[model samples]
Target: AVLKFTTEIHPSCVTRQKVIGAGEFGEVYKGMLKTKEVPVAIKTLKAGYTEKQRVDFLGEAGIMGQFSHHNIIRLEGVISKYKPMMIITEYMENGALDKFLREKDGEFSVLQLVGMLRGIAAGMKYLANMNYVHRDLAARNILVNSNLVCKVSDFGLSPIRWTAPEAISYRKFTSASDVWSFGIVMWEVMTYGERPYWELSNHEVMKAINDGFRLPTPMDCPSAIYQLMMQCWQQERARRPKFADIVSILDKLIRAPDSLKTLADFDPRVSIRLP
Candidate 1:
């Protein structure tokens, strides 16, 4: 029925009539593997899959291989006998959250971003409880399945944060670090997937964050979220809100009408707006 589609599916599957995406690296395709006709995200690595990349890919995947949670992407199995090893896993019904929002063309409001944060918080709570720190916790890493349920996927940069405070040993991803990234994801959702400081280089963005710079409440952002987002971006890692707290805050905001919501609640505006 073509219920869903993505352009990032594996190539072989697409050549065999299953891929939804296009590219030499490979495309993501939606197809059934087991008897249940359940959907699968088939990713066929391209010739570009370097040896080290493959090792990292499989190693990280091997770790995610053990994860079994409703909010995390379920790894069904792997098909590596063929060249450009194919990774088949759960297929998201709605695709990446950021991409979905972008298609909306900046039509989202605070209410929608709040809803997104709640769902993301829920997913993150599961990961936190599992002691899993998705190092690359960003909009692209978040997937939406058929029920509109958010699932965290693309574990390329995920780290088992419970084992070490220094996962990367230098500004690596941690629960708190993920929270910092979450703030950006919030911006993505609120801004309908606009790239964060598209004009800045990676070095520039890092310097900006290190220098206490942050995103402003885009015209479309919900005022209530500014405070929460600010808190998420705390420079002090220990001060960031846990997933539960984040969920609670969102719940209150969601259930409360805008009038009842406090403007003083989550103020993250810079003390002085920069010209």
Candidate 2:
């Protein structure tokens, strides 16, 4: 019965205080369900939508409900059957991973960042196992809980750099493309949330990638992590490692953290230097 549980959160029964932020579809808010003591994040759709729009809005929630993983955002349910459509999900206290790390610059060691990467990789592994392709994967889509546990969230959204070459050219969606995005995310973590592949314009980035111009290592980034990222960024999708491989690699790095200390003196290719 629990597996077949209906995802229907009653609007009247939910109470909220402040607006969280805006998402891809609508404004996000924080709320507490009348039935539970814990709070939740409420994503409400903008008013006056067509019938098809409503389906597309709630469709994200439907996909979220099918996923159950420690490093994946937990979706409570949706309130679209009634007025003022809403999607309820677990509240992530720390919010987006990139912003959180940027604010706390130099606060986390390489090992800690690698741990966060491990969580995200684990979440991606779960999605991959389910045959779900995350067309958009980045540090911005990852949310960190109060406990510093990072979980992947934003299902669909992207800019040019995060997309794979085939995806940019042919509009293909595959786990390999997700792997390419994962490499970009690894660069983000290595740079403490700095923009990945920032040297070129969108068109230039696509051209460069197609011409085999991979991103250089982030300054002071550990060779091992950067190497892993390079593997993910391989030109050919078949050459890229699977999410499962990424998870295990991150796990080993987390276990033997000293390995993370081995890094280059500085990478000259890194354009933006952090203080």
Candidate 3:
């Protein structure tokens, strides 16, 4: 049986304003949906593309079309019937979460940080409910709006540093494995986008994780938050908390701000070294 994934748009309806970035397929643009006069981000499939490339490009849009949540990126539509096939999505003013966090480092209060994390967890919860395991769940894949609302985007990949050990070793992926990557994302947010396992090669990071060396808590991270990250990174996927539980935990912490008072114990030595 065939399934319709997304609405197809006439190429004439899209107005490409400028090149904003590039993706695996081709150039990404800051464009406008002429029909609605609303801003959009368009990922264009480059000329001279092979059949396999078109399938993979549209495959992303197909997966994205299934999701509908406030904290998840919104897919506007797709343009596949004409040349320069495009995947259109809602525009995010603040862009990628990792760069945004780095640019605004030390500016956000602890509560604000928790709120950002809560939004991400909420999105992941929705995806988990749909039984869709996000192979990649990192800050770089998340986008932030003008209001600082974090939305999970870029539905792809299994980056070595963000991937769970079992997934890396056996290619087994599940919602539990996504939880493990979320732990690295938590560390990323807390550190204002510092690279995980600082200076370690991909091979080294893998060995380190296999040897049970988890990421150290970021300086000044709330103890409760750090604890939650650790739980997400449990060696056994079954031991990790579900995304639903993660959302609730973040909610409780947000409600009781006082519970986030204590800072996590940090050893500068461990955090600064290469393993």
Q: Which candidate number would show the highest TM-score if scored against the true structure?
A: 3
For model 2, residues 139-254, the per-residue Cα lDDT tens digits are 88999998789889883544788888888888987998999999999889878888766667788888888788888878778889988998898888899999989999888888
In model 2, the worst 10-residue window by lDDT is 1-10
Instruction: Give lDDT per model, in order.
Output: 0.66, 0.83, 0.89
Per-residue error at 98 for model 3, in Å?
0.6
Against the true structure, candidate 1 reaches a TM-score of: 0.70
What is the alpha-carbon lDDT of model 1 when measured against the actual structure?
0.66
After superposition, the stretches of candidate 3 with alpha carbons farther than 4 Å from their true spots are: 1-5, 155-158, 270-275
Shift of residue 179 alpha carbon in model 3, Å:
0.4
For residue 199, what is the lDDT in candidate 3?
97
lDDT (0-100) at residue 211 of candidate 3?
Answer: 88
Better of 1 and 2 by TM-score: 2
User: Candidates' TM-scores?
Assistant: 0.70, 0.89, 0.91
Question: Lowest-lDDT window of 10 residues in candidate 1?
Answer: 1-10
Off by over 4 Å in 1: 1-29, 44-62, 78-86, 106-109, 155-169, 257-275
lDDT sort, best first: 3, 2, 1
TM value for model 3:
0.91
Cα lDDT for residue 191, candidate 1:
68
How many steric clashes does model 1 contain? 11
